[PDB]
């Protein structure tokens, strides 16, 4: 086509979706990770995670307002990944890299798994 | 912070949100523009438009499944802008620029209004 493109549009959209998350506006699901609860937008979770994409396209699970993750999932690892989904920024640290990678594998977040594997390979 | 950032994340999220739109997955509102209907995600509309942000943060309108636009709004202009919201690409043409700019002013899409004004100023 003969379209023009606004370079910053996708980043501005994501910034606004994160603002809605921060103010709890139009969040439509709670993700339960053991004793912790995380409110989010189903569409953003699906756009970032192969696991959430599969969950919310299921004819029954699409209507659930609460999703319980596997008890092996670390709440901090999930928190770091949820922040990444809404910001593109990943808080990867020596102390959290193992939990973050395990959570990204479970959530099916391929690019996150890739950088975790590379950061681990560099420190061995 | 000491975060790392994935450059393509925001664009990949938007691409996935557009895929959900194309398959009518988790769309939660119909925008009526005269005889035409456009299904969308409230969160994406709010993230792109000052008008939709104001509408869906209203304690009553946030719960509406149908939103009727002003009858002066051109369905093609709205269609072009809805595509822009989900893709960052604007199909701006001599034949549609006036309708697109008028629709972007009504929807409060400042960057779109700006490029329309510049493209119009160049042709005068």
């Amino acid at each position: 086509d003969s379209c023009i493109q606004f370079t910053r549009h996708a980043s501005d959209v994501l910034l606004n979706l994160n603002r809605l998350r921060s103010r709890d506006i139009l969040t439509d699901v709670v993700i339960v990770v053991s004793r912790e609860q995380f409110r989010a937008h189903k569409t953003v979770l699906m756009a970032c995670s192969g696991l959430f994409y599969s969950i919310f396209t299921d004819q029954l699970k699409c209507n659930l307002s609460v999703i319980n993750l596997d008890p092996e999932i670390n709440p901090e690892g999930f928190c770091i990944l949820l922040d990444f989904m809404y910001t593109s920024r990943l808080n990867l640290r020596e102390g959290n890299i193992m939990a973050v990678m395990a959570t990204a594998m479970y959530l099916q977040m391929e690019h996150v798994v890739d950088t975790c594997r590379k950061f681990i390979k560099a420190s061995e | 912070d000491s975060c790392i950032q994935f450059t393509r994340h925001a664009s990949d999220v938007l691409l996935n949100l557009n895929r959900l739109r194309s398959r009518d997955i988790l769309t939660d509102v119909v925008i009526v523009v005269s005889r035409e209907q456009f299904r969308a995600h409230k969160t994406v509309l709010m993230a792109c438009s000052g008008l939709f942000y104001s509408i869906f943060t209203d304690q009553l309108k946030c719960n509406l499944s149908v939103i009727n636009l002003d009858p002066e709004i051109n369905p093609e202009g709205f269609c072009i802008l809805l595509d822009f919201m989900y893709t960052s690409r604007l199909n701006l043409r001599e034949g549609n620029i006036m309708a697109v700019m008028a629709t972007a002013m009504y929807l409060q899409m400042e960057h779109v209004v700006d490029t329309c004004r510049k493209f119009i100023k160049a042709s005068e």
């Binding site: 379209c3 023009i4 493109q5 606004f6 370079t7 | 690409r89 604007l90 960057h111």
Partner: peptide, 4 residues
């Protein structure tokens, strides 16, 4: 704005 750019030519994509």
């Amino acid at each position: 704005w750019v030519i994509p």
